């Protein structure tokens, strides 16, 4: 109409559950449908922004208002709406009531938005990071942003000033220029402070585990995954439950979440499996456990292929151990009865890899 | 008197028909050769010697001794002037219409071997001799004792060797020590005279006692897997068998005698076997199961390795099964043989197939 729908939304109940949370799913789509039509007019854009369920005067108290737009960018929605959303939050956070709460939990989504292909979106997330950075020079949605939990390992003060001032703000311009430059920049940052790399690292990783946005997981992972270790803690040591969650869900379940965000299941499989580092005993065990349990085939494939890629940098003795398991796996009575593809995939690992003298003696002696 | 004492001592020695490229006439050859190396520097002593009655000019070709002596001297660890002297003595001895009735083709291997010589003087002297041999069967069953030229060249095949490959690349081979082997390879790579030349060359390589000539000729023969249905392996296998038969003593000794290296031989002998040769690879496995010199062992396995990528699809499986079979052999395991270790080195170095791996697992 579009005011008839605007009035339908007028009589709507404000809430505190975030949009990045389970309970508010049915609400979000409804609002989001309207936003996709309202965002073409600055007039209707304000109409929408203003209806009381969004609760502009309740962000930062509420965690609803910002969460809605976070989710609208980083979502399978056309460019002008991702821009519009980034702007609604950009201008809304300059208002003054907002200089007492922290809002660090937005940076994952800005970081994500800077990997976006649309030039206008990268510039919009750039501007938004600038405003977020001017702020300090406590925590918004600290435990409610995804419903049950929020920002799991918060960012330290020195780590925050290092995130903004050392890694985030200096790379904005080239990040607007090169759709790829963000992952490169963020990796080259966490590989400027010694313990700030660690706190930024943990912070990013936790948000990657906890969001429902597969898209955010991927974009953050394009960079986060290409970091083997930082001061005694491996990225696997931080992200392994992401792998256990993703592996556990059915083919339906994965196809369905992926469809909802219009992302490709294989890309997720690859990204999830890339969480495990070479000489990580527990990550390897998780791999072997997960393949013994019934799982999506593309995931099975992705896991074994990862074991292969991991093989060259596997140390000598864990190489032997991985061959022992692969062998025993070929020899397992239950999988043999199933004639599962686990056998064939395992033998393919044993082909494609460069074996060692010791492994060969294992093969000979039984 | 330059050499009168020695020449009178050689006078009293009785000529024989057992050839120099044969077994028994060893100390005799050594003796004659020692004197020759000193006699070859003076034309006076060269002629005194050439004439000595035990050499038995002009009884060659009645007697296979005279020509075999100088043959053995080109292809020996002897100074340049002595090899040239021998090449010249045979050229001169053979332009003499005394010999226009016998066929001296059994000399061509030794010329070919001689044109690979580094010293240019030797190369051109062998050039002279190839041309003189070209203007025109000697020792056919005698040159090496029990056998001679085991597979000879027909009329068309011999004229093909002379006019087609030898004499046209002759001058460039005198300039370049390399152009000989190259010329012969690019020659066997006419038909099917190629095959008769091939058999002929190989027969002399198997049969000669001159490891140096075996090598020099193999530098070429080994560069040819097959031509018109016959594998070089099928022709050279008894060489491999003989050579594997030798003790470390005998190989080091024979090698010393000609001043060639046991390893270079190990290499050339083993490359005799082409990849997809059932009987040759089978021979390898038999030989390694028997006692052999380690250098040969290393070389045999090293060869199986190199041969692997060209092993046919199924033959990879069968031979990997065989290698495995060796590693599990209890008698060798008690010996803690180096065969086991070299086999596992093969099974490591090689790209396996799913079928081979399943063989390993179901083991």
Numbering used by the authors:
A (entry chain B): 17 to 153, 160 to 213, 228 to 402
B (entry chain A): 16 to 151, 161 to 213, 229 to 402
Tell me, in the authors' exact words, what the paper reports.
The 5' region of pre-rRNA that consists of the 5' external transcribed spacer (5' ETS), 18S rRNA and the internal transcribed spacer 1 (ITS1) is co-transcriptionally packed into a terminal ball of ~40 nm in size. These particles represent the earliest assembly intermediates of 40S and are known as the 90S pre-ribosome or the SSU processome. Within 90S, the pre-rRNA is cleaved at sites A0 and A1 in the 5' ETS and site A2 in the ITS1, yielding a 20S pre-rRNA intermediate. The fully assembled 90S contains an unprocessed pre-18S rRNA, U3 snoRNA, approximately 51 assembly factors and 18 r-proteins with a molecular mass of 5.0 megadaltons.
The EM densities were docked with the available crystal structures of yeast 40S ribosome and AFs or homology models of AFs. Utp10 is a large protein (1769 residues) with mostly α-helices by prediction. In the EM map, the M domain is continued by an elongated density that should correspond to the C-terminal region (C domain) of Utp10. In addition, the UTPA protein Utp10 adopts an extended superhelical structure pointing upwards, forming the large arch. The WD domain of Utp5 contacts the WD domain of Utp4 and the M domain of Utp10. The exposed H1 lies over the tandem WD domains of Utp17 and contacts the CTD of Utp9 by its base and the M domain of Utp10 by its tip.
